[PDB]
Amino acid sequence: RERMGHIELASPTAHIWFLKSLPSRIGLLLDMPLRDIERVLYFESYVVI
Amino acid sequence: MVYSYTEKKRIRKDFGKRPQVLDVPYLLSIQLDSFQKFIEQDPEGQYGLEAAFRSVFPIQSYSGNSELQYVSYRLGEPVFDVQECQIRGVTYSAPLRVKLRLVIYEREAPEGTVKDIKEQEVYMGEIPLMTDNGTFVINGTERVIVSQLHRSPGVFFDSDKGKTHSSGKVLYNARIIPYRGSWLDFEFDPKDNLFVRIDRRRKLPATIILRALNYTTEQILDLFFEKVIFEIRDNKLQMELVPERLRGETASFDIEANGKVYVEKGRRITARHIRQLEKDDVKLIEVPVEYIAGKVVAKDYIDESTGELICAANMELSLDLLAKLSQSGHKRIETLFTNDLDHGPYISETLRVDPTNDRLSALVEIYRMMRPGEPPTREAAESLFENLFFSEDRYDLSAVGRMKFNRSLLREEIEGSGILSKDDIIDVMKKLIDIRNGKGEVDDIDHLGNRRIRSVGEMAENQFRVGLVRVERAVKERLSLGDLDTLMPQDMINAKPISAAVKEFFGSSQLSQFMDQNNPLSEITHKRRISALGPGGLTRERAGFEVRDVHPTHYGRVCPIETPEGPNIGLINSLSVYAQTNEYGFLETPYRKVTDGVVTDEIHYLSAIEEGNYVIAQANSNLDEEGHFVEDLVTCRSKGESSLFSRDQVDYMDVSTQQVVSVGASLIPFLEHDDANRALMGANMQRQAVPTLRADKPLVGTGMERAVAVDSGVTAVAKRGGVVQYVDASRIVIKVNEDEMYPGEAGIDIYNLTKYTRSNQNTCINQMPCVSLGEPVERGDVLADGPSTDLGELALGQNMRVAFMPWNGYNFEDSILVSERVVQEDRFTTIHIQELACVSRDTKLGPEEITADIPNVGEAALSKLDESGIVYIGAEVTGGDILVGKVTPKDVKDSSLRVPNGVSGTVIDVQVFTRDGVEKDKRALEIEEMQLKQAKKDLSEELQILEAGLFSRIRAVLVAGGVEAEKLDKLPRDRWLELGLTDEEKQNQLEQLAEQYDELKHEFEKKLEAKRRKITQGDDLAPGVLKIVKVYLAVKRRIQPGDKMAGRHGNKGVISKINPIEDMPYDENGTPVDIVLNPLGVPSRMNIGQILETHLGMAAKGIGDKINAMLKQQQEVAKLREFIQRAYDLGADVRQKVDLSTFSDEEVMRLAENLRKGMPIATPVFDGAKEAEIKELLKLGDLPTSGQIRLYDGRTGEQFERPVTVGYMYMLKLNHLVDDKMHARSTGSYSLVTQQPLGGKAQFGGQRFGEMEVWALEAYGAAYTLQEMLTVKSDDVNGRTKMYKNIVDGNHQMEPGMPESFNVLLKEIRSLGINIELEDE
Amino acid sequence: PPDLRPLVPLDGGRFATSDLNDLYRRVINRNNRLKRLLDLAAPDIIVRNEKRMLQEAVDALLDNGRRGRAITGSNKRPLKSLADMIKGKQGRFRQNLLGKRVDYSGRSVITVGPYLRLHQCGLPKKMALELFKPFIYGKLELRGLATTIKAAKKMVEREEAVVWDILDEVIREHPVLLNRAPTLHRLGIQAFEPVLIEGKAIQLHPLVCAAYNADFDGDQMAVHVPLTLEAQLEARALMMSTNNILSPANGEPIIVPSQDVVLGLYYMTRDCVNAKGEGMVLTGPKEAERLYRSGLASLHARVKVRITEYEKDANGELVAKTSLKDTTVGRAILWMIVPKGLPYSIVNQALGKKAISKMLNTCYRILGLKPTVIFADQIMYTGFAYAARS
Amino acid sequence: IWAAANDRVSKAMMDNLQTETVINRDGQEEKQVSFNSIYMMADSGARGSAAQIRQLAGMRGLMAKPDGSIIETPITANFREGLNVLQYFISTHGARKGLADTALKTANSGYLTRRLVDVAQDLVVTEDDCGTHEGIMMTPVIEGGDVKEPLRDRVLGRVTAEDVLKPGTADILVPRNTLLHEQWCDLLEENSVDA
DNA sequence: CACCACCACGCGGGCGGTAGCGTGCTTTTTTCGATCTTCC
DNA sequence: GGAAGATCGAAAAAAGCACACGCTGACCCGCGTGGTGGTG
RNA sequence: AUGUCAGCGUGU
Ligand SMILES: [Mg+2]
């Protein structure tokens, strides 16, 4: 009833709750528009680091 | 008038005054007729399968080398009968076969030369068939597909009356709703700009849809505006002035023409100046050059010499631009006639806002709207726009859609293509612009003329068309595969999509509902139901207020009172008695044409839209029997509103007083004396009454019981006339008349009555004969009485002796006090049948078997079971008893079906279905033997009749030839075949008759073999199951405190106390009353119908008691004839006339025997018996005229200080029994996820302590009780166990612990990327 | 954990939907495929798509249908994700935490019981026997009538008479919480003393209907059993109907005669002009009642009766005052139930709804709580009896 | 005109119902209050009211179409008498409007109650006196013709915030922190206290 | 020994299609392009 | 005099829509490939 | 020893 499991993700994935629930915490923290974050997240535009 | 044989048994007294001009039509016609249109062979492809096949077929291959065309379709005979389908569980359906031709053309010459033709018939699935009662049998269960009231296809203009923009301005919009396609909307912006939306997408300027239709700016401006010509003079610059254009104008400049100052500068042009200019007929008027700059040029003007655009189309003019135009040589210019109030410049403003400038740009913008992300290409945009509205395969404006479209635009023609065109959209936008300007009015969306009714046929045809287009895509896939020289159409098509679509529609649709079989009225109302819900319709939560109200067009088409009370009120309606459907789906109602004042009898069915123009009088308008209204000022209705009118201005007349109510609402006597709300409750409750074990006729009725009983398929109705040859409690055999005989037939009708079969509401369906041996019958006469039916009349409740008085608070709010006799005589005892299924499947380890031995059980528990493992029929079982002994392999585990706890009764029926291949047990063999014996009995009766006829012919021939009649009589009848005659034509006749006898015997043997094969064919089941055993339990529910009872006038209540017989109030003669009711209900709940019904029932029972007393004295038939004739003649110009002179003595006696328990009275729903007639009928018997008698107290005996109202009232026992409502729980099973107790009564479960209860406890100081309910009673498992052991030990203390639901929620949140925990610190 | 997303056997060889298991399986498939792609050094044109769709699967598992289109299930419908089973009306917060299902509870239709007192409710025998089962087991084991819990269960099932006696013993002063389904305000649930009745419907006091907004109409109600000492004390001291006499919303009384009590008391307190026994002189209310029951004087006869009324002085005691009053027989009869402290002006008039309410208010203000409760019960009894007799 | 006619009919009916009963005294006759069952039920307050009785015996009066406007011709027939088809259809409009309103009111009322409970579920009396000298004014509420609520109802069962002075005398009428029960309210109203 | 029938099964996904699917609610928050204005 | 702050209006997206109970049906991958197995 | 969907109904 209590023990949980875990899956080791091969590639990092964004947590949808923080990304989507307006205002976006990722976007607010990084000061980037939600469109840019959601398009770099789903592999359609590169982003500089 | 002469009465039918069943009616002459008991004639209902009728108080109706107005003669019946039109008889009530068949109630279920709206269900049957439509389905007919679905399956009838139509030479023209307008409705049904023929229309669908014509729409889809022919089917062309990808390459123009071959095709597949459709010739004809045929529906095969159903494999199983309706009864067989119901008892076996299969779906009542018929195979569909289609004649298909495969045409392979010439490869070298594709101009149309053919090479090979292959014709075949292919089977493409089963179509479920409608029974004679307008109901479907899906998976062995009765289903009803209710009609849907949905917005009709067409163009609708509406607006929001200031609900938006906070400014009060109305934003007019227009919608083009197709039957199949995309919706086109034209809305008006707050800034007066026309925008176009497709499928509720982003709005675009309305000129885009015009540009996409190959239209330039000049063409659009020509279409949408009036051109003013400004001819350039030397210095006058005179305009082509129209006097009408001066209306509603401001003269900022002096209007002078013909050397006269017509209008002075600074003066508004009043109507006087407009009229004077109209009289002047002056065209050319001098204009200053400043007036031109404020206008917009109509068309592009080009300086040919220089080849540059001096002015384009549609921009504001200016002084420099005007000078350039003048010097360019352009003498004649055109501009737009625009008025701030008459002709607004909406199109020009929209064009200015519109960014597109060419057809390709507009198409690209439309494509970008429709398909974001995809690259807009010329081909893609062209294809998308062509397929949006101008392709038959994607857009379908139906025939009714086209008719409404043309009518809304005032077009003479009512026929056209099913696709849109440039003209249609242009006209729609023009009409919307006119409506915005002021001309025209918006369309009432809730108008019943704008709402179509879709029946079963239309929906079935649509689903079939969807399946057919899927199949046609699948067959176009295979039609281009080549090698067609060796391919047949049988294997070319696949029937899976059509069958899947039709099955999903008939089994799992929004409107294919379970049929409610509480009583015949329930089924009748359910079949005649119109639901606004369903696909392509309203939603229960978002229905709103304005759509649930009673529109004035509901008169005569939708019942205003019969509607469910709850969330779906006003969205579900019942069809009126006389209402019917057009060919387009719109409802229509009958009317009597009124010509030259005198009302005629020709019936015209007027629709909602057309009936507005005419003036329709009421049903209750007095006539002098010559057709002329007695008074001049008849109350009529013109357009959804009522008013007085002259007697010569009437156009149509209502056909009946029942035209405005439904069938269920017309069964309430004295409906005109009840409040509308109480009438609604009574009508709703009427179709919830369970049928008792003895149907009792209503002493007061409305005369519609006969129609409801006959039309519903609950009673057995003779197909042909004749005499009843054989009567039994189970079957009836009728010897048909020689007139109705068919050639080569024995001529007997066999009716097998259904006895004690469960309905969909777990009630009991039972049919009882109402005829005797030798009694002649006619076509349409009732032979058996179904549930809640007495001699062909609907009988839902019982006639109970009621008294209206308070009785020691036992009828305080709405309670009912019931005498002990009501329980003693079983007046309200009902039978309920419950079905329990044991499914013997196949498991992975092995197949389970239904056997007579179960491990770890005793012989006493197994005593009821036989050696076959199925309980004995007629054995008394109770909760926890084993019914179908089953053991499944683990050696084996007991999984036998058991009677649910709290359920008892007697096993009355066991049905075993076996998959083909599996051996049949002894019980299955016994059931098959019984069915075979019944079939053999029927066929043997037919054979006996036919062989008796043939042997009579043989004996006649023999006695004519050999005159051996005495020898033949002495000889056995069979040996007559052996005996012959001399060599003559007599021998040839005997040989022919013997051959006929042999062939008839062979034919009937073949019939018996066919019946036996059909019985023994076997039933197909779902995968994994090898046997099914269904057991039926019958329980006698007797009335008791807590049971809900009700009358027909909305007066409901719960039985509060079963008073002893001696305690009930009694009259002078010592007869106690049966029911005591609180008078306090009447003044508040304004239903005076119950009081009048009580008085009329008292009068009827007094007449019946007088008849019974006369019968008990063995009085001569003359006295009975005189008394019954006097009773029937009572009234005030009643339409019903009964003549007992022609009745003969014997029938009269029978009639008297039927009237000895109260003469029935029929009270029409709006033409009923008045108070004077009731008093006259009361005075005819030995009863007080006032209707109030003097009662005595049962317990003490003193006279009540005032006379009380006693009488007879019709009481109904609703399907809300206390034994089905009571539940209790102390400790049981719990849910496995939240560790909370289960919910419901079927499974042992506790009541839900909701949030509001927690709030109420918090409002108190209740903290320990709340915590105890939250944790130690429900969630804390350790708390539960410790509390149980403590209370058993006697300590009333708790350990609250921690609810498990909170731990579950904690782990649930923890399962996300969020950490949540409890800190000890 | 698996137990919070269980796989339910379907007794037919198949299993339930198990939405969470489906989403987890989808995520595991995507993760394994991405691992396989990565370990093969796949080009950045293929692993990119697999990573994006793995992110989509994770999105669906955490919040289905949040961004794009919900993962369609086997029934052509959106699936339920982890977030979908916490939020909403069907979520864990509002369906299993704020409210829940509880044991020691039952439900049945209601029925009027006139003989009941204000603090009593009629409970059916079967519901009472089943709800108080643990108490019955404890009492059975305490008195030695059974040797074990199984024996007590067998005795309860066999429906022995001693079981009924024990049940009568255990519910002597054990209040039960009666509740109605729409609990609009605080008075929607109240504590009543159970009286065992033979039947199938719960018998409710006529006076407490107005607080419940209940009608004997087929409406059902639920019964809960407080099973701690603290819970019983809270029910008796806070939730009892005797305590709840003033509405917390505005302080107005909630116990008021409504339909038949008012009619009966109105019929009693009314005067004719030529009734039998008019103008007679009677010694007291007892003589008037005897005369009415003997059929000698009508209930509306105008007579003069010598009555004694008690008034409260400053010291708090009662001082009597006896005098002849001109009244009717019915009012004199009704005076026999009025408590001592009240004056005679209350009943010497035609008693309507407002008059009865004012009389009860004066009784509450002057006398207290117990006299008011007894007076209300007597008023209801007399109103019912004389409405029946009228 | 029709409203006046309905009022006249109702008044005439009530006059003919409430006191028509004429009874002989020991000598001559007289008029007494009627013993009619309907009138007894209405007057005693058991069930019903003047409107329902006037619908039972007098004309049913004007009825309104679903849009809310009044229909010109009223229902001139009682429930004891017969209502024709047109009058019943007219009344069904209002009946259906009321039924739909009461069917759709429940969800909105429940949602509002849920929001109100959740906004104030954490407020509990957890002290005895803050010593606050700040209170609010309370005056009888009067809006152009009627006294909607007397001051006694508004200030009943509440604690004074400051020493209430006798009007025009500057003398304490009630102390600073006295709970205004019935006797204090009588004292306040006997001195004509406004605020 | 290919040869047809039968069952694991596995990874796969929106589904089926030579494209679209949707069309009768109200309130709150975001956001994003178009206008303006205005100001340094 | 043009870029940036202010406005702003429309489009989009999210969140909500009483409680309690009773009953009914209907369903709870897939599917096309590869491997396996009896066979005449 | 479930769940969900759809429908009907009861009491408010
Ligand atoms: Mg009720």
Coordinates of C-alpha atoms in Angstrom, one line a residue, chain D residues 2-193:
Chain D
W2 CA -59.0 43.9 -15.4
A3 CA -56.9 44.2 -12.3
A4 CA -59.6 46.4 -10.7
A5 CA -62.3 43.8 -11.7
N6 CA -60.2 41.0 -10.2
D7 CA -59.8 43.0 -7.0
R8 CA -63.6 43.7 -6.8
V9 CA -64.4 40.0 -7.4
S10 CA -62.0 38.9 -4.7
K11 CA -63.3 41.4 -2.2
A12 CA -66.9 40.4 -2.9
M13 CA -66.1 36.7 -2.6
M14 CA -64.3 37.3 0.8
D15 CA -67.2 39.3 2.0
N16 CA -69.6 36.6 1.0
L17 CA -67.4 33.9 2.6
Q18 CA -66.2 35.3 5.9
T19 CA -69.4 36.4 7.5
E20 CA -72.4 35.1 5.4
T21 CA -73.3 32.7 8.3
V22 CA -76.5 34.1 9.8
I23 CA -77.7 32.4 13.0
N24 CA -80.8 32.8 15.2
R25 CA -80.0 33.9 18.7
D26 CA -82.3 33.1 21.7
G27 CA -84.5 35.8 20.3
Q28 CA -84.0 37.3 16.8
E29 CA -81.2 36.5 14.3
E30 CA -77.7 37.9 13.9
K31 CA -74.6 37.6 11.8
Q32 CA -71.6 35.6 13.1
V33 CA -68.2 34.6 11.8
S34 CA -68.5 31.9 9.2
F35 CA -67.8 28.2 9.9
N36 CA -67.0 27.4 6.3
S37 CA -64.3 24.8 6.0
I38 CA -62.3 26.7 3.4
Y39 CA -62.6 29.9 5.4
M40 CA -61.7 28.1 8.6
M41 CA -58.6 26.7 7.0
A42 CA -57.6 30.0 5.5
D43 CA -58.2 32.2 8.6
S44 CA -56.6 29.8 11.1
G45 CA -53.4 29.9 9.1
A46 CA -53.4 26.1 8.8
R47 CA -53.0 26.0 5.0
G48 CA -53.5 28.4 2.1
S49 CA -53.8 32.1 2.0
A50 CA -56.0 34.8 0.5
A51 CA -54.5 34.4 -3.0
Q52 CA -55.1 30.7 -3.2
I53 CA -58.7 30.9 -1.9
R54 CA -59.3 33.8 -4.4
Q55 CA -58.0 31.5 -7.1
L56 CA -60.3 28.7 -5.9
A57 CA -63.5 30.8 -5.8
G58 CA -62.8 34.1 -7.6
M59 CA -61.2 34.6 -11.0
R60 CA -57.6 33.6 -11.4
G61 CA -56.6 37.0 -12.6
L62 CA -54.0 38.2 -15.0
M63 CA -51.3 35.8 -16.3
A64 CA -47.9 36.7 -17.9
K65 CA -46.2 35.2 -20.9
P66 CA -42.7 33.7 -20.4
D67 CA -41.1 37.0 -21.6
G68 CA -42.7 38.6 -18.5
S69 CA -45.3 40.9 -20.2
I70 CA -48.9 40.7 -19.0
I71 CA -51.6 39.2 -21.3
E72 CA -54.6 41.5 -22.0
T73 CA -57.3 39.0 -21.2
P74 CA -57.1 37.3 -17.8
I75 CA -58.3 33.9 -16.7
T76 CA -61.9 34.8 -15.7
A77 CA -62.6 31.2 -14.5
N78 CA -62.1 29.7 -11.1
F79 CA -60.8 26.3 -10.3
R80 CA -64.2 25.2 -9.1
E81 CA -65.6 26.3 -12.5
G82 CA -64.1 25.1 -15.8
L83 CA -61.0 26.5 -17.5
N84 CA -61.1 26.2 -21.3
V85 CA -58.1 25.0 -23.3
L86 CA -56.8 28.5 -23.9
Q87 CA -56.8 29.5 -20.2
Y88 CA -55.0 26.3 -19.2
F89 CA -52.4 26.9 -21.9
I90 CA -52.0 30.4 -20.7
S91 CA -51.4 29.3 -17.1
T92 CA -49.0 26.6 -18.2
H93 CA -46.5 29.4 -19.2
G94 CA -46.2 30.7 -15.6
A95 CA -46.3 27.2 -14.2
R96 CA -43.4 26.0 -16.4
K97 CA -41.4 29.2 -15.7
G98 CA -41.7 28.6 -12.0
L99 CA -40.9 25.0 -12.3
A100 CA -37.8 25.7 -14.4
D101 CA -36.6 28.4 -12.0
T102 CA -36.9 26.1 -9.0
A103 CA -35.2 23.3 -10.8
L104 CA -32.2 25.4 -11.9
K105 CA -31.9 27.3 -8.6
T106 CA -30.5 24.4 -6.6
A107 CA -27.1 24.1 -8.3
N108 CA -26.4 27.8 -8.0
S109 CA -27.5 28.0 -4.4
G110 CA -25.4 25.0 -3.5
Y111 CA -22.3 26.5 -5.2
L112 CA -22.8 29.8 -3.4
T113 CA -23.2 28.0 0.0
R114 CA -20.0 26.0 -0.7
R115 CA -18.1 29.1 -1.5
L116 CA -19.4 30.9 1.6
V117 CA -18.5 28.0 3.8
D118 CA -15.0 27.7 2.4
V119 CA -14.4 31.4 2.7
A120 CA -15.2 31.5 6.5
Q121 CA -14.5 28.0 7.8
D122 CA -11.6 29.1 9.9
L123 CA -13.4 31.8 12.1
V124 CA -14.0 30.8 15.7
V125 CA -14.6 32.9 18.8
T126 CA -11.4 32.4 20.7
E127 CA -11.3 35.3 23.2
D128 CA -13.6 37.4 25.5
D129 CA -12.8 41.1 25.0
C130 CA -10.1 42.9 22.9
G131 CA -10.8 46.2 24.7
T132 CA -11.6 47.7 21.3
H133 CA -13.3 51.1 21.5
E134 CA -14.1 51.1 17.7
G135 CA -17.5 50.0 16.6
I136 CA -20.1 50.7 13.9
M137 CA -23.1 52.9 13.6
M138 CA -26.5 51.4 13.7
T139 CA -29.6 53.3 12.7
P140 CA -33.1 52.3 11.4
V141 CA -33.0 51.8 7.7
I142 CA -35.5 54.0 5.9
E143 CA -35.6 54.4 2.1
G144 CA -38.2 57.0 0.9
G145 CA -41.4 56.0 2.6
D146 CA -41.0 52.9 4.8
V147 CA -39.0 51.8 7.9
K148 CA -37.6 48.6 6.5
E149 CA -36.1 47.5 9.9
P150 CA -36.6 49.2 13.3
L151 CA -33.5 50.0 15.4
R152 CA -34.6 47.4 17.9
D153 CA -34.1 44.5 15.5
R154 CA -30.8 45.8 14.3
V155 CA -29.2 46.4 17.7
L156 CA -30.9 43.5 19.6
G157 CA -28.4 41.1 21.2
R158 CA -25.3 43.2 20.6
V159 CA -22.6 44.8 22.7
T160 CA -22.4 48.6 22.9
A161 CA -19.1 50.1 21.8
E162 CA -19.3 53.4 23.8
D163 CA -21.3 55.0 26.5
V164 CA -24.7 55.7 25.0
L165 CA -25.9 59.2 26.1
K166 CA -29.5 60.2 26.7
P167 CA -30.6 62.3 23.8
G168 CA -29.9 66.0 24.6
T169 CA -28.9 65.5 28.2
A170 CA -25.3 64.1 27.9
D171 CA -26.1 61.5 30.6
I172 CA -25.3 57.8 30.2
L173 CA -28.4 55.9 29.3
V174 CA -26.6 52.5 29.1
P175 CA -23.0 51.7 30.2
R176 CA -20.1 51.4 27.7
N177 CA -20.0 47.6 27.5
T178 CA -23.5 46.3 28.2
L179 CA -25.1 43.7 26.0
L180 CA -28.4 45.2 24.6
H181 CA -31.0 42.6 25.6
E182 CA -34.7 43.1 25.5
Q183 CA -34.9 45.4 28.5
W184 CA -32.0 47.5 27.2
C185 CA -33.7 47.7 23.8
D186 CA -37.0 48.9 25.5
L187 CA -35.0 51.5 27.4
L188 CA -33.4 52.7 24.1
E189 CA -36.7 52.9 22.3
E190 CA -38.4 54.7 25.1
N191 CA -36.0 57.6 24.9
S192 CA -36.2 57.7 21.0
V193 CA -32.6 56.8 20.3

